[PDB]
Amino acid sequence: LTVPNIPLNNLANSRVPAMINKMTVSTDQNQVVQFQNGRCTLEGQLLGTTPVSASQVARIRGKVFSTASGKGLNLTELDGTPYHAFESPAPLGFPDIGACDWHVSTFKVLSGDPMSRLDVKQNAPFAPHLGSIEFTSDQDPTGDQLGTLAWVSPSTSGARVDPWKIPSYGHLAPPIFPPGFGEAIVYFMSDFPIVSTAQVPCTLPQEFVSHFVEQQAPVRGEAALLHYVDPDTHRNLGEFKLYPDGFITCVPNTGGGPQNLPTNGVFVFSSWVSRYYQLKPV
Amino acid sequence: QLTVPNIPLNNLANSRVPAMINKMTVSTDQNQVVQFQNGRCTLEGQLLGTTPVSASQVARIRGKVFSTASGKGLNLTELDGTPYHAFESPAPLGFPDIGACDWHVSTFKVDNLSGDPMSRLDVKQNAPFAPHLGSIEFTSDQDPTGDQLGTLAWVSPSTSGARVDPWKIPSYGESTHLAPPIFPPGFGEAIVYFMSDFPIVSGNTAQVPCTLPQEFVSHFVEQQAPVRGEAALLHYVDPDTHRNLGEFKLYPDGFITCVPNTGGGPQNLPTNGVFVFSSWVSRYYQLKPV
Numbered sequence: 112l113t114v115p116n117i118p119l120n121n122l123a124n125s126r127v128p129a130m131i132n133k134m135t136v137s138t139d140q141n142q143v144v145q146f147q148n149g150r151c152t153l154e155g156q157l158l159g160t161t162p163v164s165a166s167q168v169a170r171i172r173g174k175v176f177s178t179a180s181g182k183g184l185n186l187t188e189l190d191g192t193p194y195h196a197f198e199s200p201a202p203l204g205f206p207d208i209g210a211c212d213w214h215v216s217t218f219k220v221l222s223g224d225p226m227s228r229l230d231v232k233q234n235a236p237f238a239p240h241l242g243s244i245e246f247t248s249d250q251d252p253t254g255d256q257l258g259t260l261a262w263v264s265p266s267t268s269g270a271r272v273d274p275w276k277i278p279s280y281g282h283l284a285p286p287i288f289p290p291g292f293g294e295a296i297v298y299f300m301s302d303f304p305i306v307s308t309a310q311v312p313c314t315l316p317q318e319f320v321s322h323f324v325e326q327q328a329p330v331r332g333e334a335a336l337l338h339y340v341d342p343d344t345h346r347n348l349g350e351f352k353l354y355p356d357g358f359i360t361c362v363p364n365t366g367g368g369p370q371n372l373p374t375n376g377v378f379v380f381s382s383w384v385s386r387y388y389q390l391k392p393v
Numbered sequence: 394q395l396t397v398p399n400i401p402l403n404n405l406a407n408s409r410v411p412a413m414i415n416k417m418t419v420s421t422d423q424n425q426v427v428q429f430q431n432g433r434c435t436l437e438g439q440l441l442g443t444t445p446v447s448a449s450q451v452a453r454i455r456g457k458v459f460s461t462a463s464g465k466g467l468n469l470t471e472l473d474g475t476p477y478h479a480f481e482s483p484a485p486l487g488f489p490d491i492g493a494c495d496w497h498v499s500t501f502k503v504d505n506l507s508g509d510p511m512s513r514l515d516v517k518q519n520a521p522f523a524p525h526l527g528s529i530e531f532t533s534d535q536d537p538t539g540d541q542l543g544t545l546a547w548v549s550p551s552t553s554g555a556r557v558d559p560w561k562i563p564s565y566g567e568s569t570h571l572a573p574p575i576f577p578p579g580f581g582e583a584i585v586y587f588m589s590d591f592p593i594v595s596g597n598t599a600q601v602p603c604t605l606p607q608e609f610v611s612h613f614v615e616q617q618a619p620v621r622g623e624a625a626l627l628h629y630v631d632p633d634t635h636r637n638l639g640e641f642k643l644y645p646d647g648f649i650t651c652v653p654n655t656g657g658g659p660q661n662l663p664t665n666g667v668f669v670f671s672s673w674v675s676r677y678y679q680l681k682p683v
């Protein structure tokens with residue numbers, strides 16, 4: 112097993128199309144998350160709606176159809192092949208930013224302005240598991256539309272967007288529980304236009320996901336001990352544990368944590384360790 | 394030891410636009426020379442041109458809005474906001490390389506958002522287009538200010554009568570330190586182009602070619618493998634049956650070739666195959682047609 116030999120700031124977010132710009136721990140270190148993207152086991156098994164490429168993250172494709180009030184999308188996979196309402200929560204790569212309006216910029220798969228912005232609410236007709244969502248748009252999209260989540264905003268006036276939530280979809284990756292004993296889940300944060308924190312967290316950089324899928328490495332221990340290394344001085348900046356279920360922890364120093372580390376370090380696999388191997392605080 | 398990504402073609406990203414690869418092809422003129430600045434990396438992991446590491450850096454722009462007596466522009470930075478220094482690159486890393494057309498780039502202001510946060514920056518590749526020196530002019534129907542970060546959304550012709558040719562690169566300048574041209578390397582070989590659907594208005598097709606899938610680029614950067622021959626022989630393999638569907642050569646300078654059958658080529662291959670490194674071979678190794 113290896114992890115990507117790529118500095119953190121050259122890694123992509125796995126929940127929105129953006130680069131990672133810092134790490135952090137949650138304000139409540141017992142907080143449980145259940146992100147559906149950026150989920151993959153160390154052996155390379157994708158979970159939830161997680162796709163392989165950073166260019167599949169938080170994208171939607173579907174055929175426009177007429178609903179009672181306007182238009183909707185009958186979803187397909189991003190490659191245009193049919194979506195089958197089966198075991199996954201939604202088509203692969205479907206956004207997982209819950210409890211907010213989405214604004215998705217799509218094109219018809221040209222003359223004039225080719226873009227449509229689809230404004231999607233997560234209310235009753237939002238049924239991505241079944242394969243359909245509704246939208247309003249100031250443009251006139253028709254046919255086969257492919258696009259990318261552009262920004263998010265509150266579901267109702269006065270509400271706030273919490274990008275730590277996931278949608279109700281109508282094989283949902285399981286919750287990630289802080290494993291105890293002072294360890295805290297490490298979240299990888301990206302700037303992203305959120306109207307009304309304005310950073311989106313994820314639990315694995317996208318290139319970690321493709322790395323695990325590509326490598327199909329056997330898991331040889333209860334956790335993988337990683338070092339976060341300065342690529343210029345080659346000094347070890349901190350210890351992290353990578354768990355088989357596909358998330359990373361550290362022991363954050365009180366009043367601090369991985370948010371105080373440089374954002375240009377490289378994670379390097381060091382050794383397999385037991386589940387209760389104690390980390391040096393960071 | 395050199396490997397290539399164990400990822401099927403349809404799960405690979407384009408290295409010139411933010412899109413997934415949906416097929417391979419060869420150019421209609423098989424002697425056509427290209428000089429793309431993104432998707433460029435040697436087998437030893439040396440990035441060339443403006444090529445970034447991540448698929449989510451591809452064809453993106455960041456900069457600070459400034460005004461002139463005549464209009465507005467962006468003073469470019471790198472995508473992480475750090476200063477862009479004109480040195481040995483054509484532009485900031487990840488900067489689009491779709492030449493000779495108007496660009497339409499959707500940006501947001503980095504940091505307390507209210508209302509519609511997006512601005513569409515309309516960029517012309519005329520005189521004020523000087524990304525190598527670190528600035529471009531734009532017009533916009535919105536009101537972007539401050540630190541704007543965004544992604545190429547679509548492209549359209551420079552003039553009314555014109556077409557978009559996504560096989561061209563910009564004029565970045567003046568010496569701009571371009572990644573060198575890629576010539577078809579002889580022995581009946583044709584460069585393999587990886588295509589993605591993308592909104593090109595008034596292109597002959599709505600597709601953008603690139604010469605390396607983006608995950609190949611990051612793979613080479615990570616691996617930092619030594620080059621041990623004049624070319625790497627690859628097989629394109631069906632992941633279910635494990636059978637070899639065709640021979641390809643991967644060159645040290647960072648591109649892939651095949652010998653296409655007359656009237657055909659890799660465009661006729663299934664799109665769910667995986668490239669696998671086979672062996673190092675001589676420059677003169679003659680490929681079986683595909």
Ligand SMILES: CC(=O)N[C@@H]1[C@@H](O[C@@H]2O[C@H](CO)[C@H](O)[C@H](O)[C@H]2O)[C@H](O[C@@H]2O[C@@H](C)[C@@H](O)[C@@H](O)[C@@H]2O)[C@@H](CO)O[C@H]1O
Pocket residue numbers: 212213230264265266267268269306307506507508509
């Ligand atoms: C449909 C539409 O055009 N709505 C505009 C408002 O934005 C909507 O806000 C609601 C919640 O209030 C919801 O997020 C929709 O998805 C938004 O499209 C707009 O409100 C202003 O901008 C919003 C994004 C909101 O977040 C806030 O910034 C502000 O109230 C109003 C005001 O210009 O115009 C509406 O047309």
Ligand SMILES: CC(=O)N[C@@H]1[C@@H](O[C@@H]2O[C@H](CO)[C@H](O)[C@H](O)[C@H]2O)[C@H](O[C@@H]2O[C@@H](C)[C@@H](O)[C@@H](O)[C@@H]2O)[C@@H](CO)O[C@H]1O
Pocket residue numbers: 221222223224495496515549550551552553554594595
């Ligand atoms: C500034 C503007 O919005 N102009 C509209 C034209 O779009 C511009 O076309 C020029 C080239 O003529 C260039 O591509 C700019 O980037 C565009 O913004 C528009 O042209 C029509 O739509 C274009 C996207 C393109 O498909 C063109 O072939 C087509 O004629 C014209 C016509 O609607 O209106 C202009 O106001």
